[PDB]
Amino acid sequence: SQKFDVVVIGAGPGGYVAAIRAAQLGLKTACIEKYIGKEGKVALGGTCLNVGCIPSKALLDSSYKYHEAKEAFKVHGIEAKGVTIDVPAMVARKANIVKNLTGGIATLFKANGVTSFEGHGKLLANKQVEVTGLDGKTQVLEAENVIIASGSRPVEIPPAPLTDDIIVDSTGALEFQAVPKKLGVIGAGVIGLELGSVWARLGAEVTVLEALDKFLPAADEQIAKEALKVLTKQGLNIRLGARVTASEVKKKQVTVTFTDANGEQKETFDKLIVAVGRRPVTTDLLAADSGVTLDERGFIYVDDHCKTSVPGVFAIGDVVRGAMLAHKASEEGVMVAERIAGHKAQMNYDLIPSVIYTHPEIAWVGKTEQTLKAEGVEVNVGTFPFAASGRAMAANDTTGLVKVIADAKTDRVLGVHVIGPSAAELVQQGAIGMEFGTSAEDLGMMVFSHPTLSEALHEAALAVNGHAIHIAN
Template identity: 70%
Template structure:
């Protein structure tokens, strides 16, 4: 094996493996180092997202939704299924099979693009050298013209709820339950907490989400967040805001373990809840442990992220960093696009990335999705804007599919009519908001979207109607504004 490359990528998550493939496509001799191992101790690509994040969680979300639909939703369609049961080990096995298939897909892509896949750890040394330690312990120093750091992130641990891998788990452990816990506690009502809480709530758990913040989904448009909370509470999630966990105690009761959680409620009073399982979902932090030598020249910012400029270049010449390990939202697609940008910059192209138009999705059911500015952000910026909203209740396709909860909110500039943001809670929200993201990339106005022909009957008609509603022109609901 040669120890000299044009590019060495450390990490093969969505940011790293995409960067490696694009580098190879551009004719650069590329190696990608990945430390992740499967249950058999074999090296696998894909990082957190593929192995214990985006993909496995969506597999379980889909399985649990199908179960809930069969259990509660079939009757209205005239379908009788009185003895629906869930086989949790089979559900987990399906998830594992999907992960293996997708990881194998990356391996195949690496082979097709002639990316050298190295399993083990990588540490950046001075002068763009990388200390590579293989899974078998063999150590070697590699050299590269450019190094891309894509080491990702890991769950944040909190001292008051130390994970034991059994009763108290992080997001990874929550993907491995072999039975449905009767009482499930979730610390954190953010993206991960809501998704994992939804999985087990649909399967029968009584779920309590304890959120320290006093607002629900603070990063989302608050009109959409309020609507989403109403829907999720109706589904059975017990979401408690302004609740700060102060302690946990694992005890034996009736021959099994349970955890007593102590917390301060919204009124400042001490309260306790007992759960069979507790998931800690209080966020993620950049993973830089063992990644950088002291003389590597790479600097960290005050949050522990690798410091980069707008083009993802670090403070060390020829060293780049992308994905969760750098500033910005910890989103797989954001990391992938940064990987493409860096690969193309290394190859001499002038690629830049538009950080203003990055979709954000929460995969509950219904989904919650957004792109662009929220109304709160625009108010804070003092920007003049107009808003149009439209409920799925007035969309024929949504009513026919029993998916009529939620709404689309479109925000456009008051003077130019250029679309500034779109926020959705409802069926297929992730895919619908992407339509608006494309429009925003081309500088579309709400009038442009309103004048576009949308298929009927489709869920996406709600996007068109919300765009029309910006100026009081919605067709299928009464308008609040006087039509011009």
């Protein structure tokens, strides 16, 4: 009876980080994973490494370099005679990076002493974990603690079931072997905007159909308004308030029927991406007498420390409440492992940053202006546009702004929101300050290197209290 201090089900950002940290803390750790990768063998890394964060960013980076060479080289004096993109080669570089990184997780497991099991894990009664191998044979592990990290999968919609290579979800959208001439996207969330951007940059004519009237409702309204304008200018035909009701595939095209403010509409595409959210994965995960309970939406019910209804059983990442993000999952894995080891590790769910990897990049941490207004919190706001940044001018990349929101009474920074170059790095600067309880004046008093994009955060913080140097307060 193989006994472990910790058995982790799933090897995505939540599970594989939890497993490594547990091993670092001296806990005898096992990690169970079932996903078969491109080589026909089990591949670690979950959604983020295999069909998620890293593959998307690889294609975003390649497609942006092509786009800049095609549309933004002449101002530098650079003449490029006939620039082209080989989509199979672009996708192959992405696939090679995925291969390398997933293999790297297995190397980390070996270096840290994590025992890997290949197959489907199911929690039985009494913290026993049944592993069904690829050959259908089972093995039962005895666990002192179980960490459930089974992740999520794309939401499906009746009008647009996945079909051949014509209707795809995010996984298929990362595998096109040619630029789709006309590309439809259902959902103007982060996946729809990122993957729509990839293919628009390479020449696709993209329409994004979004059910809600409000664009990027979790973002600060000023940021979202600028994002909608800029992304529309880049060729993302974002249609808000569009209710998709049907589709039809014929002649290797897909016609989508939807209702908007002006009635019933139809639009035809060569490919259709369905990007309407993700849902937690619990299929065959829990024995009927396991004791673990689910909430109304199918997530595993946990407390603020990711502990389930069963002592010694925890659940982390996309399968539990909170932002469905990779750094959220990994930090929960660290917390759970450290608490199993006896440390009072806690998580601040208030300072988890968000990033949308469009270009311009969008990122934020903390609260939006509209949220604080709804809460009745009086605030001071400071903004600085990249159009006034010398570094951004040198970069030929002046779209966007930095926004800092501070409490009007205490001057404590309550949110930092950026659309523009290096948005994620500037928001991380703001997040570090907020971890220490920074005021806007604190940020203003620091020495920021010149010329850097970081100066825009410095100026925005000074603008909170009306004495930015480089804008007319």
